[PDB]
Design a binder for this molecule. Structure first.
Ligand code: N8A
Ligand code: ZN
Length: 257
């Protein structure tokens, strides 16, 4: 089974998921001087006021907060998108040290972590159908750097000790994901893929230029999670990121100058 170790990590994934070598894989390095400003791109519309968080889960590859996606409660619209995308979950990728952890890079710079807010296109009715479509998902990616604390992350950090090992979950209601967003919604966008198996080429990526800052204490709590299940040899959940993949026949567009 796939993971992030020497014998099951990203360089092995293509054996079970041959699309790993496909034409629109993620993440990628964002070369800021080569991204082209597109004046036709609209502002992103992030409408999270009615979000209903449900549960937080350690799935053995990250921790995920899930939302009620049975109605248009927390939706992403505008930007490069046509139609309405419902928020299903968010999760993070992070490093063993502050100089690595992000999936996307910016002029080869790696951030300490990366937040993925995962949304699916309501025209396909459910996320399983959306993953089989080239415009099925929109993932809003937000970089994390280490410095000052992010107060809106603290409720997440404080429950992680209850989901230490793979398969554990907890009720996580009334969490407001607006507390995770930076000031600016300036973004880069490109067509890509899921960054974990099945690596489906179904994602419009929207990566925010402005990182959020989190404290060293907050990221240390991420690094105390375990990849293993309870009772198995402890392997800290760190470095759960896929490296940048070939850009191939794609242009990254910027919403800003
Ligand atoms: N990391 S990401 O590109 O935001 C992203 C977003 C939504 C997703 O469903 C995934 N992939 C994911 O959750 N995979 C779960 C594990 C799995 C599911 C199906 C087959 C093999 N492995 C990644
Ligand atoms: Zn992700």
């Amino acid at each position: 089974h796939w993971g992030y170790g020497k014998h099951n990590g990203p360089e092995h994934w293509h054996k079970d998921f041959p699309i790993a070598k496909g034409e629109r894989q993620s993440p990628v390095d964002i070369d800021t001087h080569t991204a082209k400003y597109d004046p036709s791109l609209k502002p992103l519309s992030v409408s999270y006021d009615q979000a209903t968080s449900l549960r937080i889960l350690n799935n053995g590859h990250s921790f995920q907060v899930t939302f009620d996606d049975s109605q248009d409660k927390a939706v992403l619209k505008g930007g490069p998108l046509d139609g309405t995308y419902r928020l299903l979950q968010f999760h993070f990728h992070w490093g063993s040290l502050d100089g690595q952890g992000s999936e996307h890079t910016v002029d080869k710079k790696k951030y300490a972590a990366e937040l993925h807010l995962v949304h699916w296109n309501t025209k396909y009715g459910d996320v399983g159908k959306a993953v089989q479509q080239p415009d099925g998902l929109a993932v809003l990616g937000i970089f994390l750097k280490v410095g000052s604390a992010k107060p809106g992350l603290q409720k997440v950090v404080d429950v992680l000790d209850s989901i230490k090992t793979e398969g554990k979950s907890a009720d996580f209601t009334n969490f407001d994901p607006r507390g995770l967003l930076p000031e600016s919604l300036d973004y880069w966008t490109y067509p890509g893929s899921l960054t974990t198996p099945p690596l489906a080429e179904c994602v419009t990526w929207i990566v925010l230029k402005e990182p959020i800052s989190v404290s060293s204490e907050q990221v240390l709590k991420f690094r105390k999670l375990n990849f293993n299940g309870e009772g198995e040899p402890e392997e800290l959940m760190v470095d759960n990121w896929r490296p940048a993949q070939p850009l191939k026949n794609r242009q990254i567009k910027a919403s800003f100058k």
